Structure formats: structure tokens, C-alpha cells
């Protein structure tokens, strides 16, 4: 990974009409499809489920075709209410009648390790070293490199997690702020600690459904059925948000800058989603974007096992469960926003968090 500064060079960079985001997206699709080919397919598990209350969790009993095909075995499993839909007490796994669920393989970690991007022969990568560079326009001084820095391919919705901090100042970017269909990216120059956890004491049970195919389910939670929560500190947050407010005063006509919760939509976009240790969290952010001292801003979260991110018609993903509890400490280094329109007058601009359009997470 060699770097060499290029003196007296100015180039017109463009973060939005780039191609490495459109290649990173397709390469994430390709690797996630390749890595889930030698894994279990839960097409035999699309059966009627006798589900009762154990809360958001349902104790579901159902029967399966075991390893000996002419014998049927009754088994039990704890499924969240978001992972099942009714058809009474009869349910089926969500997205069975539209998609082919594929269990994420155990003993193959899906950790977002840092990924460098090295240019091929005959090409080069220019990096812009200007600290206040928003993403578009000229750069003061650039550097040719072989391989980019370690880019963790994180998955998020409303808060960019484990990203690269801005060096000196908060960096705000859009294609055109007066256009409202275009997500506004905001890079924090100061990380905000966020510690989050699933406190349930799960016990994983293995279910054999075929020749070497195993289906891992939750079963028999021990102790209190507690709620997954996502803590942020009210100290550093709203300080960083006041800084963001100050910076967004200048990039528009003078108006009061203040924040609203997310609009209606799929729990995939109305809540800050991510992926912690293979467990998919969906934490509501209504407590962050609704209007100042030390404390904690504890956010309710909903765990979802059957999730279909980067929406491919006909595919899903059963994320297997983990025994014990887990904890999720990360560094918020970014923030995705959007702007409500209309002739609302009163000189206040309402910014809501925005989700979907996953390429934005790698534009940052």
C-alpha cells in the first residue's frame, strides 16, 4: 500500500457519479451469493406452525421430515413475531411464499473485515487529502495510491457505524440540497460511543432436516425475557447534533435547523438497522431526532431473524441464533438525512433520517 503526494495537482472529484460504489455494491451481492451456496435451504421448513405465547416472541411447535425420510418428528422453536405471519394459532415463516430462505452458515464468520481496493495494471487511484473536502469539486492536493485504506463494509440504515472519521471538521454532502429526493450525508469528526445489547439468555437447539443439513433455532430462554436496547450517551450526542445544526445553518437560506423522527415505511428504513454478531437489530430512533445534559438515550430494538437486505426478489436469509447474550459496541461516524419539502413557511427546516439505497453507506 504505497502512497505518493502529487504537488500542484487539482482534479474535479465526484462522490456521486463514482463507479467504485456501483462495483462495491455488486461485489457485495456476488460474495454474499457465493458464500451462501453451500448452506442450508429452509424450503422443507415452510410448514404450518402451532405458535402460542411464550413480548414479541412465540413458542412454535411443528413437524418435519427427519434424516430418515419416511419418519416425521415433532420439534419446537422460539420464533419472533416479526419472523412469522398468520394464515387461530397457525403461522408460517415470513417470506416463504415469495422467497427461498437460506440459513446463514455457522462456522463461517460474516464479520466486516477491512477491504482494500487495489487498482489493476495501467490504472491508478487518486485520493483527495483536502480536509474540508465535501465530496464534489476541486481538490487542493491529491495522492496516487495502489490500494485504498481499510474499508469496512458495514451494513446500516440511519447511523453509519464503524466508519472513517473526518480529520478536522464535520463534512456535509448532497448532489443538490434543494433537491429533496437525495440523501444528505453528514460525517462526524468526533465519534459518538454507542453500546447496544441483546440481554436474552438463549439456548441454541440443532434440528437435523436432511443429510448433513442442520437448522439452528432458539429454544428455552432462561430467566427474564428482557428487551434488546441500544444505549447512546446524551452528553456527546446533542453536542454533535448541535454542531451539525450549526453547520446546516450555513448551507441553506437562514432558517431554524431542527430535527424530526423518520417517516412511515418498512421496519428496514424506519429504524436504525445493522448487524451485530449475525443478529439483526432494528432499533427505533424516535428518541434521537426529537428535541440537554448527561444521561442515556436508551432505544428499543426488535430482533429479526429472517431478513432480506439488498432486496432480491426470491431470496431471504435466516440468521442463526447464539447462546448466551451479546453486546454491540460501535462508533457512530456518520449520519444520513433527508429534507421535507412543501411550502411550509415559518423558516424551520425539518430533517428526518433516511434509509434504503444501500450504496450511500459506501459513498461515505
Amino acid at each position: 500500500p504505497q502512497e505518493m503526494v502529487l504537488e500542484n495537482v487539482t482534479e474535479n472529484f465526484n462522490m456521486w457519479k463514482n463507479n467504485m460504489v456501483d462495483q462495491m455494491h455488486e461485489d457485495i451481492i456476488s460474495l454474499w451469493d457465493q458464500s451462501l451456496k453451500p448452506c442450508v435451504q429452509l424450503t422443507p421448513l415452510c410448514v404450518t406452525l402451532n405458535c402460542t405465547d411464550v413480548t414479541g416472541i412465540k413458542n412454535c411447535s411443528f413437524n418435519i421430515t427427519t434424516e430418515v425420510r419416511d419418519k416425521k418428528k415433532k420439534v419446537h422453536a422460539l420464533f419472533y413475531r416479526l419472523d412469522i405471519v398468520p394464515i387461530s394459532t397457525e403461522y408460517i415463516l415470513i417470506n416463504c411464499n415469495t422467497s427461498v430462505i437460506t440459513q446463514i452458515c455457522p462456522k463461517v464468520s460474516f464479520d466486516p473485515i477491512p477491504i482494500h481496493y487495489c487498482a489493476p495494471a495501467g490504472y491508478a487511484i487518486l485520493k483527495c487529502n483536502n480536509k474540508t473536502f465535501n465530496g464534489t469539486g476541486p481538490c487542493n492536493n491529491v495522492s496516487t495510491i495502489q490500494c485504498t485504506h481499510g474499508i469496512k463494509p458495514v451494513v446500516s440504515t440511519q447511523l453509519l457505524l464503524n466508519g472513517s472519521l473526518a480529520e478536522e471538521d464535520i463534512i456535509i454532502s448532497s448532489e443538490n440540497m434543494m433537491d429533496n429526493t437525495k440523501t444528505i450525508i453528514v460525517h462526524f469528526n468526533e465519534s459518538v460511543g454507542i453500546e447496544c445489547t441483546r440481554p436474552n439468555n438463549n439456548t441454541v437447539e440443532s434440528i437435523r432436516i436432511g443429510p448433513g443439513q442442520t437448522f439452528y433455532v432458539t429454544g428455552e430462554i432462561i430467566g427474564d425475557i428482557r428487551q434488546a436496547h441500544c444505549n447512546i450517551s446524551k452528553g456527546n450526542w446533542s453536542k454533535t447534533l448541535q454542531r451539525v445544526k450549526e453547520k446546516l445553518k450555513k448551507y441553506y437560506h437562514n432558517k431554524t435547523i431542527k430535527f424530526e423522527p423518520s417517516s412511515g415505511g418498512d421496519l428496514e428504513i424506519t429504524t436504525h438497522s445493522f448487524n451485530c454478531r449475525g443478529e439483526f437489530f432494528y432499533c427505533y430512533t424516535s428518541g434521537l431526532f426529537n428535541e440537554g445534559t448527561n444521561g442515556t438515550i436508551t432505544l428499543p430494538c426488535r430482533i429479526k431473524q429472517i431478513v432480506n437486505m439488498w432486496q432480491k426478489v426470491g431470496r431471504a436469509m435466516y440468521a442463526p441464533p447464539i447462546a448466551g447474550n451479546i453486546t454491540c459496541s460501535s462508533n457512530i461516524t456518520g449520519l444520513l438525512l433527508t429534507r421535507d419539502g412543501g411550502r411550509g413557511t415559518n423558516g424551520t427546516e425539518t430533517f428526518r433520517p433516511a434509509g434504503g439505497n444501500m450504496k450511500d453507506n459506501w459513498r461515505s
Partner: antibody
Amino acid sequence: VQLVQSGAELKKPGASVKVSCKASGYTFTDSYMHWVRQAPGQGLEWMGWINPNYGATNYAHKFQGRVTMTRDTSITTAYMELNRLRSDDTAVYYCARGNFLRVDYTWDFQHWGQGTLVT
Amino acid sequence: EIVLTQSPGTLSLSPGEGATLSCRTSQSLSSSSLAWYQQKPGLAPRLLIYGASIRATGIPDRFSGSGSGTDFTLTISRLEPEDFAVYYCQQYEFFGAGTRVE
């Protein structure tokens, strides 16, 4: 591009309407479904757009809190539900597909549906 | 907040004449941000020019337009009987009131 809208009816104070913009014959997922309010013999207004792959929606400051825009992709039909209608809601309602659908990236609403004149 | 005033007048004209229409923008935007629309009496509006210079499909040649910054302009050389309807200038989100031709 075929857009087949629904029929109108006068709604009393406090009711709820659910107008639809059933689409056909194109890539519904990669297509915004902006909604547009025609005041009676007056200038238009922008109700709001709805990305249908995620439901990510943005309404106008005027109707923020009174409206909600669901979408269905299986049958490729977008929805728009309006609660708490008053008698001053006299208008027409159309759905326009644009915003990079056409060559230009800026909002260039070309195809329009059939209209719905809920008073 | 982008104010789109339009010129007054009702344009009491006959077929075969010309028509000059104009729309003003409250901020220094490029030509790509403004479009023009035919507003028919009780039917679905259609688009002529998007980008202030690029014509749309299925549209005759008689309509042209240009402008940068402020004071964008549309000109029609030959008013057919169907062209005596209202015309709207569309911004990102806020439509125009609509200048009148009889």
C-alpha cells in the same frame, strides 16, 4: 406505461380515503411514484413521493401528519391513504412517475394516470 | 421557498399567432432545474421541455425554450386550436400558478 387509478367520492369530515395508482408493464421497483394535488382551477401541489422497494416516503409540510402513502409491489400497486379530510380538501389527485425515470435526473414527470377528484 | 412568479395577462389571440411565456426563479439555478407543462382543461397534464432546452417524445417542433439564471422563457410559433390551454412551470417540487392564453 399503463397507470390505472381509482374512483372518487365525497368524504365527510373525519373519514378516510384510500386512492390507488395500479401500475403495469414496467420495472415497478426502480420507479418513484410521486403524487400531485390539483387544486380546482388553480396551481398544482406536491403531495409526496414513495420509493416502492423500501417504502421510504417524504410528504409535504402542509399535509405532514394527515396523510400516509403505502405501496404494494407484489401486484405493483402503490397506495395513498388520506385521513381526517375536511371540506376544504376539494381537489383532484394524480400520480406521476419521473425523477430520473426520464433521461434528466431532475424531476421530469412524464406519464400520468387517470385522475381522482375527491372533494 | 423557491418562488415561481408568472407574468399576468390572458392573451386574447386567434390561431396562427405566436405566444411568449415566462417564469421567474428566486435563486441562481441552472437550466436543468426547470420544466414546462401543458395544462389541459380537465385532462392529464403532459411535459414538453425538461431541462429548459430538451424536448420530449411525441411533441411537435413548434415549441422552444431557453434561459439560465432567472427569467426563463417559452415561445410557441403557431397556436393550433388545441394549444389554447394553461401552461405550468415546474421547479423541483413547487408547481407554477400558470399563465393564461384564451
